Design an enzyme around this catalytic site. Sequence first.
Site: not given
Lengths: 246, 245
Positions: B162, B92, B94
């Site tokens: 993403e 991810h 993040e």
Amino acid sequence: SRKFFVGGNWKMNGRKQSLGELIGTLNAAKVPADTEVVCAPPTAYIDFARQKLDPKIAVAAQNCYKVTNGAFTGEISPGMIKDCGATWVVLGHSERRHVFGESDELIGQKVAHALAEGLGVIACIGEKLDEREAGITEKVVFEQTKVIADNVKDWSKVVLAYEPVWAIGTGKTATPQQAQEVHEKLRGWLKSNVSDAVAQSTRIIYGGSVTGATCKELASQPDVDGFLVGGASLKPEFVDIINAKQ
Amino acid sequence: RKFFVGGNWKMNGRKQSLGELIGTLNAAKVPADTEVVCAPPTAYIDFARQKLDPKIAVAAQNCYKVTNGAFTGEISPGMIKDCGATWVVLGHSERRHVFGESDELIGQKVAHALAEGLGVIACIGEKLDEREAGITEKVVFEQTKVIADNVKDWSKVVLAYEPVWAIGTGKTATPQQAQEVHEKLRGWLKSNVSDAVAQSTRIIYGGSVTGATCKELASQPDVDGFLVGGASLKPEFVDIINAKQ
């Protein structure tokens, strides 16, 4: 009159079955009326452990982040830890610092947030082998303790844990004498930089190798107030360690 | 390629609010042609699996790369499975950008999770500077390269794009722009595994997805579903589940 404190860091070990067995054994143990016991399960099992452990034993998270909620996939907050019934968080553990590269600044921010949220904090410090061999022990641990201290405004909710990282899985070993030596320096730091009252009242626990055979000599050292136990926390030997002052 | 809708709860919620969300999700009639997965905070994987109807799968938001060990603060695929979860989100943005997780580390996590019988939602995506510098393809290809190496069976892996370049930057991705990247990703694949795999691998969109945008995004040729952020915590998630209906 600092209360003896024994923390069990289960690290990344166990499943529901095996942790269930561990918990059963701990529930059966009779804990001295003078001893504060805390268990730190893997993050997936904080809830599980709190449900199964006798209320006499506290639960700690092994880590947390520095805000209450947010876009931080894979993290948990003090608010979540409290919500699961846990009352402590371990912060600044050597593995967080040295495998996952958590900075002193980050650790400070987490300490500030956890404490603001009403969680207790077990704040870990300790020097690596390269630092020990350079004779820079005091410099390193003092720098680390300073950042923790600058982010504490109520010491009644914190326990300091000294990890001799230099001894763990490198080649060297720590004696009760060198443990006492560091603890004594740390308490002196607290007296000099925080207050006399904080120095007298703050528990400084030893987070190096601890066995049933070594816990008595370590616990009798004047400035060692208990333990943060690694591997032995997974076995019946943990109970022996709980009874180190007996 | 079965439509796939994942809800990433990120670091949000408590037992009370998450219980209410699960109530709403349990009440939803999930389409037979849609696979639905929720990724709760780590402290709540167990809680969520217990409360969620079996029709919805549970994912961890991260894991480490060995079964047990001296890794304070981590959890393993074995623990995730033990809690009844069947997926893990890896790589991810993040984790990559806030927590400095390397492509190498992400790849080893992918290999371990797959070896341990977990499905993997593997995330990729370029930042604004990389997009602006014209390096979208170089960045997304390098990230996908390190993932693919650690996949020797694509049956249990979903790829999530993403558009990090569109997160709080003042830029947004159009459905066309989403489709464009998804096409490039699948092209990187088709040549590199099989016609069957690039043809079978679901590539889901991890950008801004809402009730207002989900239908148009779901209609794009190379968009197989979503990894949803904020809307996953809201009744709005049900509209996104319904995107192909």
